[PDB]
Amino acid sequence: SIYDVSDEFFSLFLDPTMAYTCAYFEREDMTLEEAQNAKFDLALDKLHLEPGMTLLDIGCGWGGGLQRAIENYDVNVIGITLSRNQFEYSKAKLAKIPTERSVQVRLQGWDEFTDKVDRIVSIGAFEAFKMERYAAFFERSYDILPDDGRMLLHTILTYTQKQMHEMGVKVTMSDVRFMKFIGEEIFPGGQLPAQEDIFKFAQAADFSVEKVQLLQQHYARTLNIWAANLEANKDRAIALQSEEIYNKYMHYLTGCEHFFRKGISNVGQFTLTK
Template identity: 60%
Template sequence: ESQSIYDVSDEFFALFLDPTMGYTCAYFERDDMTLEEAQNAKFDLALGKLGLEPGMTLLDIGCGWGATLRRAVEKYDVNVVGLTLSENQAEHVQKTFDAMDTTRTRRVLLEGWEKFDEPVDRIVSIGAFEHFGRIRFTRFIYTEIFPGGQLPAQEDIFHCAQEAAFTVEKVQLLREHYARTLNMWAANLAANREKAIAIQSEEVYDRYMHYLTGCEKFF
């Protein structure tokens, strides 16, 4: 089901995402940041917590269009593996990986996290938890945006992490950053309404506009 969500054409998503194709909360370190700058700041924020060293292998669960992994290769000189359930995303990631000038290994696999059993040094996952299981959300989100998915509560994440022998060292709230990200996405999509309808349909355009503007209100 997650595959169908992101297998709307890449051209459609490119109408409202920034050039990195980051589709999770951006991190606005400064008020004057562009969306692209804020997305790169988000990648740096996440990667900076991992203690990466050259030659390590980093796994990204739910790698999207691969921006986090490309950033990791460029800044930390690591080997990377991305997991996605989207054929479109996997094809895009592989093309961008192939174009990189590096000796580090870059792989993208069309499979879920539960099937991956290779050893890695670090794991990152940004904005993928809502696809992992079974918690109720609003009917619109459940039926239209993330069919069959879940958005676990913070307490559930803590519990599962501790059960797996991990420790939670820091909690960082990004509510205002996500509201601003969603607002910018919606503005970009609205500005490209005619192109979006031509690429997909008015029904798909309306669905995503309702999703983006509705989610902004939650934050």
């Protein structure tokens, strides 16, 4: 399976910050790492952080995001992931950053988390959720934030066939073939949300959506690069794993890129306020 590969495997195509999400090429000539930090800065600015606050990163991945938070803001931070790989890797990377604040890494899910915070960020972890938990997720998010609390949710988004038809988006058979590949290798029963779903469940918990920012073509470029890297690191990827996992990932990356490029997929940042 592709879920059993090492962090060292991801390093064959991810940027030095180990960000496995959509990059933000605020400038067309940005590098991947520069675009990645830009994405993080983009998200963090939206939270209106003041010194002394506490920030929560739900599904902190390999820590690239909490790094920017410590460096550029004077706040306590808490990151929670369920990957032990990430948990130990992030705890180590983040310990090397100077700070006069608290820094806690926990191997923990959001259902377990119950501490009070001031701001919340989530990037790429939502698409791993089941639609049956959406309501509870926002209910917990809303409950730990303060009166003026704010949260930024970054997540991939999908369309309905109606909308895709409305946009002249012609889904071919190959596209459907790739969808099964997803439901087989990636999504063991998992419905990806559409923009309106975010609004519904978010506002249902009494949040206020103040902005959504969509970055379709950024992910296509993001994906275009990850793929090229793994291809350049082909022989090493096989050595780490096998030609099977290699071809598996290539197909995954290249297909996901095509979906964002053609217009089947999207990715948005939702600013939610309390």
